[PDB]
Amino acid sequence: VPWQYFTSALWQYNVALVQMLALCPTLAVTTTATNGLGMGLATTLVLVMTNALISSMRHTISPEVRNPVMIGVIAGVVTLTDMAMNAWMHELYKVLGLFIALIVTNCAVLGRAESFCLRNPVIPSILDGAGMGAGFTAVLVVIGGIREILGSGTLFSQASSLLGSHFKWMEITVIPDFQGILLAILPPGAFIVLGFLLAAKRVIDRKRAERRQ
Amino acid sequence: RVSVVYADPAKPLQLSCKVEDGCSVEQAIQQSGVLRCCPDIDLKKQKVGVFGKFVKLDSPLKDGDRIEIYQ
Amino acid sequence: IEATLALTVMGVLLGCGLGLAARKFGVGLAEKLAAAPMLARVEASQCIGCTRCYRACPTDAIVGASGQVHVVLEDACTGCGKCRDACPEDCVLLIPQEQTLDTWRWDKPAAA
Amino acid sequence: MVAYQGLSLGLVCAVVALLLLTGNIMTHGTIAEQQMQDRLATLREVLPQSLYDNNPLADSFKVQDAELGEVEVLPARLQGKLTAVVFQGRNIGYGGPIEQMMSVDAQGKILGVRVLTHKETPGLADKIEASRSDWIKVFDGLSLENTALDKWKVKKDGGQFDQFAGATITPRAVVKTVLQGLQFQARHAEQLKA
Amino acid sequence: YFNLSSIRGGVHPAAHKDLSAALPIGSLPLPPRLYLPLRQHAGAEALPMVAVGDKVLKGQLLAFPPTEVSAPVHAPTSGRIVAIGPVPAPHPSGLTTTGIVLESDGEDRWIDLDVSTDPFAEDPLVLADRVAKAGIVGLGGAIFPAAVKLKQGTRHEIKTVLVNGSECEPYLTCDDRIMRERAEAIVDGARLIQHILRAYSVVIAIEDNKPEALAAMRAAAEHFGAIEVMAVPALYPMGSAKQLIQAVTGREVPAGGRSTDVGVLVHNAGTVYAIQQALRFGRPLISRVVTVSGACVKTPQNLDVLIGTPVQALIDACGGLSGDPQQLLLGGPMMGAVLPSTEVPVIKGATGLLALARHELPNKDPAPCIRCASCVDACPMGLTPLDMALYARADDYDGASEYGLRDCILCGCCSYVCPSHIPLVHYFQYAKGQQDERRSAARKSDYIKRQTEVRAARLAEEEAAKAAAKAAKEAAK
Amino acid sequence: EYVLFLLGTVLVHNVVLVGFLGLCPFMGVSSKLDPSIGLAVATTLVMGLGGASSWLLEHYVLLPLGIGFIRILAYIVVIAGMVQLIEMIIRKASPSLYRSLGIYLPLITTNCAVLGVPLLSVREGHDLTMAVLFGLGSGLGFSLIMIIFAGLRERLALANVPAAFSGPPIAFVTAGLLALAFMGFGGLI
Amino acid sequence: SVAAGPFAHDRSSVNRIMLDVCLALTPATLFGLVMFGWPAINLWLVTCVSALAIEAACLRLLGQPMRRLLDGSALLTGWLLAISLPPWAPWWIGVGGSLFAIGIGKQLYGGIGQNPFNPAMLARVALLIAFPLQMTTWALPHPLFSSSAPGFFDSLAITFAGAPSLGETSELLLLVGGVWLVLRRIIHWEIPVAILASVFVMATLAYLINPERYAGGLYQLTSGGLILCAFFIATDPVTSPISRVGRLIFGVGCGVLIYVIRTWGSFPEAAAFAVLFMNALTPLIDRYWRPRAYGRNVRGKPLVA
Ligand SMILES: CCCCCCCCCCCCCCCCCCCC(=O)O[C@H](COC(=O)CCCCCCCCCCCCCC)COP(=O)(O)OCCN
Ligand SMILES: CCCCCCCCCCCCCCCCCCCC(=O)O[C@H](COC(=O)CCCCCCCCCCCCCC)COP(=O)(O)OCCN
Ligand SMILES: CCCCCCCCCCCCO[C@@H]1O[C@H](CO)[C@@H](O[C@H]2O[C@H](CO)[C@@H](O)[C@H](O)[C@H]2O)[C@H](O)[C@H]1O
Ligand SMILES: CCCCCCCCCCCCO[C@@H]1O[C@H](CO)[C@@H](O[C@H]2O[C@H](CO)[C@@H](O)[C@H](O)[C@H]2O)[C@H](O)[C@H]1O
Ligand SMILES: CCCCCCCCCCCCO[C@@H]1O[C@H](CO)[C@@H](O[C@H]2O[C@H](CO)[C@@H](O)[C@H](O)[C@H]2O)[C@H](O)[C@H]1O
Ligand SMILES: CCCCCCCCCCCCO[C@@H]1O[C@H](CO)[C@@H](O[C@H]2O[C@H](CO)[C@@H](O)[C@H](O)[C@H]2O)[C@H](O)[C@H]1O
Ligand SMILES: CCCCCCCCCCCCO[C@@H]1O[C@H](CO)[C@@H](O[C@H]2O[C@H](CO)[C@@H](O)[C@H](O)[C@H]2O)[C@H](O)[C@H]1O
Ligand SMILES: CCCCCCCCCCCCO[C@@H]1O[C@H](CO)[C@@H](O[C@H]2O[C@H](CO)[C@@H](O)[C@H](O)[C@H]2O)[C@H](O)[C@H]1O
Ligand SMILES: CCCCCCCCCCCCO[C@@H]1O[C@H](CO)[C@@H](O[C@H]2O[C@H](CO)[C@@H](O)[C@H](O)[C@H]2O)[C@H](O)[C@H]1O
Ligand SMILES: Cc1cc2nc3c(=O)[nH]c(=O)nc-3n(C[C@H](O)[C@H](O)[C@H](O)COP(=O)(O)O)c2cc1C
Ligand SMILES: Cc1cc2nc3c(=O)[nH]c(=O)nc-3n(C[C@H](O)[C@H](O)[C@H](O)CO)c2cc1C
Ligand code: SF4
Ligand code: SF4
Ligand code: SF4
Ligand code: SF4
Ligand code: FES
């Protein structure tokens, strides 16, 4: 079934939890959960588009010039994405900054472009790209929620200004009247949260294996 | 430079001793000292071979051989 | 637009460089690129001296020949099994290595 | 074949380059108008429409001094007479450089100071923003004649401007650049003072 | 000379030497049966010459050496042989070994020894072979045959013969009493060794906690010229060869090299006395001097013990076990082996029979290493024992060998000064045992491959030769 | 002076701990010390070379033609056309030199920082020499932090880390404490 | 199973070492608690008890024996953290500091002997970064029974809830305790000698170069806890080199970083950052500066004679 690639792409192989890839935007833009949601959505869209293009052009690639071709067919596409978000999603564009343009070297994306889409049809490539984009989005949302709850108290914030006013129902405040721990927003607060998340993932993997046995 | 093996099932003995070139079984066994360690060894009734082929008492042997005494 | 000229010049020259240099011969998969003993046994009555044990033994383990000589092995056995099937009476009685003083070592401490 | 292992790379490169000019001809105008209305919305924050009659973003100056270097002073002329000048200031804070704007009149009175960009510590020094605190509106009636150069400091250094709890810098940077901008307006008269 | 000291490490344990070095050297009544193990040395194991039921005399050669690096085993008393079989061994394992059982008749008749005439006249090879046919084994713990050591000494040039009289272990006082009572024989043996190995002087060295031994050695050796008596300080790793060489001469023995490269030879005082007895009188090595000590012994003493005497008779001679023996070692407390029982015999390498009670034994509860670097400050070879312990505990023996496991002498200075009480020497012995097992397996595989290659080559050559011979025969038919 | 700028790029403005550039390969290779040394020297040389080629391409081709928005493509294409070239040459070349530099080829060519450094260099308008020194400063900073982290992880490999934390979680926590230690250098240069 | 030697010991123990370090610390701690008053006493007790309880919880979670609590390794971390804190600090600062040290800095790495960083200085750095307002409001001395210090319940309201020749006599007791620690062979003199010598040399040459800018470094030379950091903090055995040249490199670099971050940095609390940087730099110094063996040269080849 094509749908099992999508289901395998969330948890059994995750880009930031299993294969240890795309850690730059994982630890860089995660101070707010809406920022992680927007970056994950943009990464998912770019991954789906470039996976479709690479799998469409799969029987045209020279073997020893294989890198600067696909990098090229990544790069302009990402530039088009940048030239979307500088025109209509400019509020999200100022928040991410460099890393929305820095998707052409998001390893997970190039690792997916080289390993998967060079030998499989268009539909499995699109499904696997969407699945690993969704897994990256879920990881970013979880880490952003943990860090922003620790650092300011509130869950998903400035959703109207960033992701549109229609998402205003996502604003929820937990721990009211809280100044917040300033270290969690800072760069040392991201590595520790990712390490604890990896340890928790290993713990529930062992517990699920023990439940199945 | 030869070796000597006594093939007793109770205690298999192996020694390595140096000989003059052109030696026979008799002088190699006498110089080797197998007789004094096992006084129950008879050189004329019990059987002597080299590498598994039956050998007479006065025959020459070359380098690397293994005199084996047994039943 | 003349941007096409510069872009294909950069492209064809880098590609041509790869093509000429080819004459001189994932991220995860490149990282890995970067980073019981047995002993035979012959008894005292079961072997009648058929010498097939010595006949099929590449190691010089069994010593002796001819008949009713009670051929016996040495420490040069490996348990390869060439002498089991060779002998018709099936006296080769391969057993493992028994613990003695010279094969005694020290044990690891349990836990800290 | 080296030949095509090359050409190939070539056409890819170019197809990606022609795809990148049509996108500009749709989007460049739609980006530029957003940038200039962002500048206009920043301009309306410090000054109202009553003080100026001509368009402020049409006769921008370029004045060279000895400390700031080049400035981008925008005038506010009612009928051929200078009434206010709006310009920008750079200063290093704690987390990096800070861009803030001042809108000082023809007589030296500050009509408003607003911070465009800064890098500081959340929850600790965001009070420079006018959407959270009133502190940045302390510069609304002062000038260079009713405040000599002893009170243009924070209260930690012996001035009259309050400092946030847990910090003397970011107010030091803001008050220092406000003082330096007033001194800059005092230095080149007539064209920026009148 | 002019002793450099330094040592770059060392500890000062409680000597406990005052409680046994008061009484003179006692004697033993003849026990009924002796167990002589056939391997009391290093190298290969000697083969028996006598059979069951034979009558032997005191000094008969019971077993003979099969190769060069071995030593014959002599009969300690006259009697009848009853077994050539399994005997208990002085090992912590408790396993048995090949050995003779001698039933002592009690008459104690000496054999017609081959005495010498004018031993300061002959060439050194005859004296070395006379030492070889005596069973001299180097009574210092290393149990290396003194004939092989002297023969290797005669090849090079020796500028100093070193007498290792600095008995450094706690609770042991055998060397003190033989240097007090047999000083003239030790000096004569040192002069005999100086005649064997053409050298300059003997530099007989005693620790400073033996003033009576120093006075007796100085009084015995004052008319002889080149003989020198030296007072080394009181350190635990001072009696070691590589450490006393550095303490006296000032130079270091190169790693993986013998002491003869520095032009020096090291001999224990009991070994020098045995060499003197063997050369002057022809008597083989049949008895030695051991120390019975500990708080669990009624009268601690130094006794002249025939080789193969059971431990229980040695304990029963020294009053008896006055209490419950928590540990019963064979040697000093820093190199002792837990004896399994009291039917264990006394080998030539047995130095003491300490019976340590509860209050002399430290209580230990291991803890993780706090990296206090007290092991580096006490290791005599300047190694890093903590890194050896982390690499050996993680089964990375090849990694541990780089940090100094090749140079470890198992001296025990590590676990003596360890705040978190860690069995460091146990880790080193375990790693060395695993490395020795791997080396033995590799050597067996290489030998067995050479053997099968040689057998296949000769079988193919014989078959081809006989095929060509039978082909030539039928052509002429 | 150039020395203070170099020290500020190495310590005050490190490319990993305060810059968040290059963490994937840096989290993957740093289990062992020798591939970390080889990776460090390869990325230092090629980031200096990439900064030089990026500055030349921007100030000699891109800016005089007036087109700028096609930077995040030309840069990486030239960098790709650099990197593989050298490494594929060093596949044959001296066979001894493909024991320390060439084995580490495809990690470095993306690495996010060989493109992160020229864009930040373009943002502040450096000259040729200033951009080259910026590239070698970022390379030295990445090299130093990778050697330090590789030594720390090799020490932690033989330790008694719990089984739910041994491996990459203890590496992430150790890197967080390392960045917490490196925060003292803020405001120095 | 058989027992292995050696069968002797010098009666050393880890518990004796940490209790002797606390005994050396106690003269300065008493004069600190007397001169700041009851809130310092409450903060010290809260920090020490919280560190001990979190050590007990982390030992219960990991399955380690509870006797590992009795060596004093957690009480020493709590003691050094509590004397490194601002005196009239709230209780959650001390509890969060003990939780960040015992826990993340020590017990998450396995326990005692396995951590790569100094726990107390990690906690102090994390408290300074996370809570900058509470950790930079330094109170003034208010001596016990001096009719101007607050009472018992007022000091309770100061520490819990939210109600709003002195310096030289404290460093002398720390100097006496550190000297006594050297004389008992518990710490090695290389790290304090190198730290003080390098700081004094750099400060005095900066004074002789620039007398109107850098003259404020000689008079207030031991400011920021240089004596305490030199003697009790940088001499941590687990996170320091085991050699002599390594300890000299550690001390010289620690003093260099202390002076650089103190003078030209943005932090006056430079000691913890310097110590943390050189605990990071420690394993390379350990691996590249091993002591010479017996009969071998520095390169590791056998000697020739
Ligand atoms: C206002 C409140 C402020 C709170 C934050 C304060 C600042 C941070 C303080 C963190 C303090 C952590 C203290 C404990 C650290 C761990 C101590 C060792 C525990 C341990 O190793 O147990 C092992 C791991 O546990 C497991 O297997 C399960 C691990 C599950 C981890 C789940 C993490 C979820 C995400 C957390 C993010 C927030 C924390 C990081 C900021 C399992 O033991 P074993 O299996 O070896 O032995 C089995 C029996 N023999
Ligand atoms: C502040 C401005 C005004 C002052 C201007 C000067 C500023 C400070 C200058 C400091 C200079 C540091 C270097 C001095 C030379 C070395 C002195 C130490 C000598 C030494 O190695 O002795 C150790 C003990 O000393 C120790 O324990 C010494 C440790 C370091 C102490 C530093 C201060 C020296 C005074 C010490 C006494 C203080 C008393 C206070 C009432 C070892 O001896 P060991 O017995 O451990 O050897 C057993 C080893 N196998
Ligand atoms: C590993 C050892 C590191 C050795 C480091 C050697 C370089 C450090 C010493 C020389 C420091 C020069 O740094 C000098 O000092 C001040 C601190 O007052 C720095 O910093 C100051 O100004 C800058 C910008 O205005 C801002 O960061 C801030 O306002 C302030 O901290 C300046 O950039 C420089 O003028
Ligand atoms: C909380 C209980 C323990 C408190 C007492 C600690 C005793 C041991 C001292 C260790 C070092 C403390 O660190 C030392 O303390 C003094 C006195 O507060 C600090 O000094 C601080 O307060 C004093 C008095 O307001 C001022 O000089 C200044 O505000 C600040 O420097 C210094 O930064 C440092 O030199
Ligand atoms: C071993 C016991 C547990 C120790 C650890 C827990 C400490 C608990 C501290 C609780 C603090 C509550 O906070 C503090 O309470 C005290 C009394 O306790 C109040 O004190 C008030 O009541 C007390 C009597 O109860 C009066 O004597 C006092 O004059 C008045 O101020 C303070 O105004 C308040 O600030
Ligand atoms: C491991 C050791 C941990 C030590 C932890 C001790 C924590 C003590 C603080 C408890 C939290 C706040 O506890 C308390 O709350 C109450 C109201 O809720 C307020 O206090 C109020 O009630 C207390 C009774 O408890 C009265 O004595 C006091 O006069 C009044 O002000 C203060 O805010 C604070 O004193
Ligand atoms: C540092 C790394 C480890 C972190 C571990 C967790 C640290 C311990 C918990 C930190 C709690 C943070 O929450 C902390 O709550 C206290 C409660 O008095 C708030 O304190 C607030 O209330 C009090 C009393 O009403 C006021 O006097 C005070 O001015 C105000 O700040 C702090 O501003 C906030 O920072
Ligand atoms: C390991 C060895 C020890 C290294 C320790 C480092 C100590 C500090 C380094 C030297 C720093 C001194 O800092 C230096 O002070 C001098 C004072 O002459 C200043 O010099 C300034 O004033 C002097 C007059 O006083 C002028 O002549 C000069 O042209 C001007 O630059 C420098 O601008 C500043 O760089
Ligand atoms: C081994 C360690 C080596 C340490 C480094 C040695 C090299 C140091 C050279 C830098 C010398 C200091 O050079 C200069 O000194 C002046 C005093 O005149 C200090 O003064 C500075 O402070 C402020 C910030 O507080 C700056 O905004 C300002 O530009 C300047 O006045 C700065 O620190 C530095 O700009
Ligand atoms: C750890 C260690 C401890 C030693 N202890 C002693 C000792 O107590 N007494 C002694 O005479 N030699 C001691 N030695 C030295 C050897 O045991 C022996 O004297 C030397 O190597 C050869 O001397 P021999 O030929 O007399 O056996 C020790 C050596 C080592 C390595
Ligand atoms: C001399 C000495 C100094 C110590 N200094 C510290 C210190 O500064 N911080 C700390 O948390 N523990 C310190 N300890 C305690 C011990 O080193 C700590 O438990 C290690 O971190 C063990 O993980 C010290 C112990 C000794 C013996
Ligand atoms: S082949 Fe078998 S039966 Fe025949 S002699 Fe050999 S062992 Fe005995
Ligand atoms: S098992 Fe193989 S090696 Fe062993 S004795 Fe038999 S034939 Fe020889
Ligand atoms: S046992 Fe080895 S490492 Fe330990 S002190 Fe003795 S020689 Fe040094
Ligand atoms: S003596 Fe023990 S605690 Fe100290 S360094 Fe050696 S092994 Fe570690
Ligand atoms: S290096 Fe940034 S995503 Fe891999």
Coordinates of N, CA and C in Angstrom, one line a residue, chain F residues 11 33 37 144 147-148 150-152 154-156 159-162 165 170 173-175 177-178 180-189, chain G residues 62 100 104 108-110 114 116-117 122 125-126 129 238 257 260-261 264-267 273 276-277 279-284 286-288:
Chain F
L11 N 35.5 32.7 19.0 CA 35.0 32.5 20.3 C 33.7 33.2 20.6
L33 N 37.5 10.9 17.4 CA 38.3 12.1 17.3 C 38.9 12.3 15.9
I37 N 38.9 15.5 13.3 CA 40.0 16.2 12.8 C 40.0 16.4 11.3
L144 N 37.6 24.0 16.2 CA 37.9 23.9 17.7 C 36.7 23.3 18.5
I147 N 36.6 19.5 17.8 CA 37.6 18.7 18.5 C 37.3 18.6 20.0
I148 N 36.8 19.8 20.6 CA 36.5 19.8 22.0 C 35.3 18.8 22.3
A150 N 34.4 16.3 20.4 CA 34.8 14.9 20.2 C 35.5 14.3 21.3
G151 N 36.4 15.1 22.0 CA 37.1 14.7 23.2 C 36.1 14.4 24.3
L152 N 35.1 15.3 24.5 CA 34.1 15.1 25.5 C 33.3 13.9 25.3
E154 N 34.2 11.2 23.5 CA 35.0 10.0 23.7 C 35.3 9.7 25.2
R155 N 35.3 10.8 26.0 CA 35.4 10.6 27.5 C 34.1 10.0 28.0
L156 N 33.0 10.5 27.5 CA 31.7 10.0 28.0 C 31.3 8.6 27.5
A159 N 32.2 6.2 30.2 CA 31.6 6.6 31.5 C 30.4 5.6 31.9
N160 N 29.7 6.0 32.9 CA 28.6 5.2 33.4 C 27.3 5.9 33.2
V161 N 27.1 6.4 32.0 CA 25.8 7.1 31.6 C 24.7 6.1 31.7
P162 N 23.5 6.4 32.1 CA 22.4 5.5 32.2 C 22.0 5.0 30.8
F165 N 19.9 7.2 28.6 CA 20.6 8.5 28.2 C 21.9 8.3 27.4
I170 N 22.9 12.3 25.6 CA 23.9 12.8 26.4 C 24.8 13.8 25.6
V173 N 22.7 17.1 25.6 CA 22.8 17.8 26.9 C 24.2 18.4 27.1
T174 N 25.2 17.6 26.7 CA 26.6 18.1 26.8 C 26.9 19.3 25.9
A175 N 26.3 19.3 24.7 CA 26.4 20.5 23.9 C 25.6 21.7 24.4
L177 N 25.2 22.3 27.7 CA 26.1 22.8 28.8 C 27.4 23.5 28.2
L178 N 27.8 23.0 27.0 CA 29.0 23.7 26.4 C 28.6 25.1 25.9
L180 N 26.2 26.9 27.2 CA 26.1 27.7 28.4 C 27.4 28.2 29.0
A181 N 28.5 27.3 28.8 CA 29.8 27.7 29.2 C 30.3 28.8 28.2
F182 N 30.0 28.7 26.9 CA 30.5 29.7 26.0 C 29.8 31.0 26.0
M183 N 28.6 31.1 26.7 CA 28.0 32.4 26.9 C 28.7 33.4 27.7
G184 N 29.8 33.0 28.4 CA 30.6 34.0 29.1 C 31.4 35.0 28.2
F185 N 31.6 34.6 27.0 CA 32.4 35.4 26.0 C 31.6 36.5 25.4
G186 N 30.3 36.6 25.6 CA 29.4 37.6 25.1 C 29.8 39.0 25.5
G187 N 30.0 39.9 24.5 CA 30.4 41.3 24.8 C 31.8 41.5 24.9
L188 N 32.7 40.4 24.8 CA 34.1 40.6 24.9 C 34.7 41.3 23.7
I189 N 34.4 40.9 22.5 CA 34.9 41.5 21.3 C 33.7 42.0 20.4
Chain G
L62 N 17.8 5.9 39.9 CA 18.8 5.1 39.1 C 19.1 3.8 39.7
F100 N 19.3 22.1 39.4 CA 20.0 22.2 38.2 C 21.4 21.5 38.3
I104 N 20.8 17.5 36.6 CA 21.4 17.7 35.2 C 22.9 17.7 35.2
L108 N 22.5 13.1 36.0 CA 22.1 12.7 34.7 C 23.3 12.1 33.9
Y109 N 24.5 12.4 34.3 CA 25.7 11.8 33.7 C 26.2 10.5 34.3
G110 N 25.4 10.0 35.3 CA 25.8 8.7 35.9 C 25.9 8.8 37.4
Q114 N 31.5 10.8 37.1 CA 31.2 10.7 35.7 C 30.9 12.0 35.0
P116 N 31.2 15.7 33.3 CA 32.4 16.4 32.7 C 32.5 17.9 33.1
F117 N 31.5 18.4 33.8 CA 31.5 19.9 34.2 C 31.4 20.0 35.7
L122 N 28.0 25.2 37.2 CA 26.9 25.1 36.2 C 25.6 25.7 36.7
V125 N 26.0 29.6 36.9 CA 25.8 30.1 35.6 C 24.4 30.1 35.1
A126 N 23.7 29.0 35.3 CA 22.3 28.8 34.9 C 21.4 29.7 35.7
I129 N 22.0 33.3 34.3 CA 21.5 33.5 33.0 C 19.9 33.5 33.0
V238 N 37.4 15.5 39.9 CA 36.8 14.9 38.7 C 36.9 15.7 37.4
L257 N 41.6 33.5 31.6 CA 40.2 33.7 31.3 C 39.4 34.5 32.4
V260 N 40.4 38.1 31.8 CA 39.9 38.6 30.5 C 38.4 38.9 30.6
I261 N 37.7 37.9 31.1 CA 36.2 38.1 31.2 C 35.9 39.1 32.3
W264 N 37.6 42.9 30.4 CA 37.1 43.3 29.1 C 35.8 42.6 28.8
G265 N 35.3 41.8 29.6 CA 34.0 41.2 29.4 C 32.8 41.9 29.9
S266 N 31.6 41.3 29.8 CA 30.4 41.9 30.3 C 30.0 41.4 31.7
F267 N 30.7 40.4 32.2 CA 30.4 39.8 33.5 C 31.5 40.1 34.5
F273 N 32.6 31.0 34.6 CA 32.7 30.8 33.1 C 34.1 30.3 32.7
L276 N 34.2 26.6 33.8 CA 33.4 25.8 32.9 C 34.1 25.5 31.6
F277 N 34.8 26.6 31.1 CA 35.5 26.5 29.8 C 36.7 25.5 30.0
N279 N 36.9 23.0 32.3 CA 36.4 21.7 32.4 C 36.0 21.1 31.1
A280 N 35.6 22.0 30.1 CA 35.4 21.5 28.8 C 36.7 21.2 28.1
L281 N 37.8 22.0 28.3 CA 39.1 21.7 27.7 C 39.9 20.7 28.4
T282 N 39.4 20.1 29.6 CA 40.2 19.1 30.3 C 40.5 17.8 29.6
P283 N 39.6 17.1 28.8 CA 40.0 15.8 28.3 C 41.1 15.8 27.2
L284 N 41.2 16.9 26.4 CA 42.4 17.0 25.5 C 43.7 17.2 26.3
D286 N 44.2 16.0 29.3 CA 44.5 14.7 29.9 C 45.1 13.7 28.8
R287 N 44.5 13.7 27.6 CA 45.0 12.8 26.6 C 46.3 13.2 26.0
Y288 N 46.7 14.4 25.9 CA 47.9 14.9 25.2 C 49.1 15.2 26.2

